[PDB]
């Protein structure tokens, strides 16, 4: 159904963008170690 | 449908804004490297 | 519809506030670079 | 309707709390300036 | 209704946890001030 | 109902994980203190 | 049902990604501790 | 809410029209009873 | 909830009007019995 | 909203067609009266 | 869930009242014998 | 949306079938006149 | 899903009861024929 | 979606059953002519 599919698009989009934040934070950690 | 369309707008707008956060965090990492 | 309108309000409000977070993170990067 | 009103409450509660985060990040930037 | 009540629970739980993030960020600012 | 229960799961899961973020931020504050 | 399942997927995907953020912040704390 | 109000409109319109059918059938009974 | 209450109103209104139809048909049967 | 509007269309269409049934029953009563 | 239970009530109430119509029609059939 | 469309299908299918009942009732009235 | 299943129960229950009405009308026809 | 499919099932089942009622009524008309 179109509603369920849109809800899955939220899951996917939100998760992917949150993981980008996590990767940027690892970059902060590497900068601090360097 | 309109509910599905609005849900997709949440996915798009939240993802885009979270990616702006990720980018600002990379700016912080770059400042910490020097 | 009213449910679709309220979902759009979530999209707008969340995106705007997340962008304020990104802008604040940029302020942190500026402070580190000064 | 009650579902739309609860969604609006999500929009309001989330936005207010995310702006609290933005403000705390401004406090970090201010701490770094000082 | 139960859907509305569950949405209000999202609002309440998310806002409270986001405020805990804001507080922890204030603790970072305070550590930097010291 | 199953939709209400799934919303409650969003509330519980999101709140728990956001609290994990708050705790990790407090560890950052502690590291800055020491 | 499919809407309930999609909502559970939001819960799981968001909680997992938020946990990755928390871990990355622990990594920053470790970097700051030396 | 708008969905609830539309459902109430189904209840009202359907009941009123079904009552018209019952009245018409009473007219039939009256015609048979001469 | 308001949607469930409106659906219950459909059930109640439709059943009561359908029973008026059944009653009018009984009246026809009795007119035909003489 | 489109769901409310569709529900209103059910109310209108069903009511109108049930009234056509009631009218046809009145025609039976008329035929029985000569 | 309360919406599902209300829909089941429509099913039950409408079916019971329609069966009352069927019984009344059988009474007409018996009167015509007859 | 698909739910709205399926609701419009109920309105259409129900109204058409109910009109067939009304025509069949007119055929009874006609038979009674002869 | 439970809502979809409840809607299917409406379809089944109403169709079966309406077919009982059709059968009783066939019994009226037979009584007239005899 | 499953909800839209179940609504379509109501449309189909209800139409088919109502047509059976129309056909039985025409049998009554024919019995009356005979
Ligand atoms: N801000
Ligand atoms: N027949
Ligand atoms: Na849908
Ligand atoms: Na500042
Ligand atoms: Na569903
Ligand atoms: Na750590």
Numbering used by the authors:
A (entry chain G), B (entry chain D), C (entry chain E), D (entry chain C), E (entry chain A), F (entry chain B), ...: 1 to 34
Paper lines:
For the α-helical barrels, CC-Pent2, CC-Hex2, and CC-Hept, designing orthogonal variants was more challenging. Therefore, we took a different approach of incorporating non-heptad sequence repeats into these peptide sequences. Variations of this 3-4 spacing can lead to alternative CC sequences and structures. For instance, in 11-amino acid, hendecad repeats core-forming residues are spaced 3-4-4 apart at the a, d, and h sites of a → k repeats.16,63–67 Consequently, while heptad repeats drive association of left-handed CCs, hendecads lead to right-handed quaternary structures.16,63–67 We reasoned that replacing heptad with hendecad repeats at different locations in the pentamer, hexamer, and heptamer sequences should alter the hydrophobic seams and, in turn, might confer homo-specificity in the resulting sequences. Initially, we made several variants of CC-Pent2, CC-Hex2, and CC-Hept that extended the second heptads into hendecad repeats, with the new designs denoted by the suffix “-hen2”. In these, the original a-g sequences were maintained, and the new i-k sites were all made Ala. So, we tested Ala, Ile, and Leu in each of the three designs. Generally, for the CC-Pent2 and CC-Hept designs, these experiments revealed less exchange between the heptad and hendecad variants compared to the homotypic exchange of the parents, indicating that the strategy had increased orthogonality. To investigate this and test our hypothesis of altering the hydrophobic seams, we compared model and experimental structures of CC-Pent2-hen2, CC-Hex2-hen2, and CC-Hept-hen2 with Ala at the h position.
De novo coiled coils (CCs) are particularly appealing modules for designing self-assembling systems as they are short, mutable, and sequence-to-structure relationships governing their folding and assembly are well established. For example, CC-Tri and CC-Tet exchanged with each other, as did the higher-order CCs, CC-Pent2, CC-Hex2, and CC-Hept. These two classes—i.e., CC-Tri plus CC-Tet, and CC-Pent2, CC-Hex2 plus CC-Hept—are structurally distinct: the trimer and tetramer have consolidated hydrophobic cores, whilst the others have central channels and are α-helical barrels. Similarly, peptides with Type II interfaces where the g, a, d, and e residues all engage in helix–helix interactions—namely the pentameric, hexameric, and heptameric α-helical barrels, CC-Pent2, CC-Hex2 and CC-Hept—also exchange with each other. To address this, using the insight from the data and analysis presented here, we have tested two different strategies for increasing specificity of coiled coils: (i) alternate placement of salt bridge-promoting residues, lysine and glutamate to discriminate the tetramer from the trimer; and (ii) incorporation of hendecad repeats to separate the α-helical barrels.
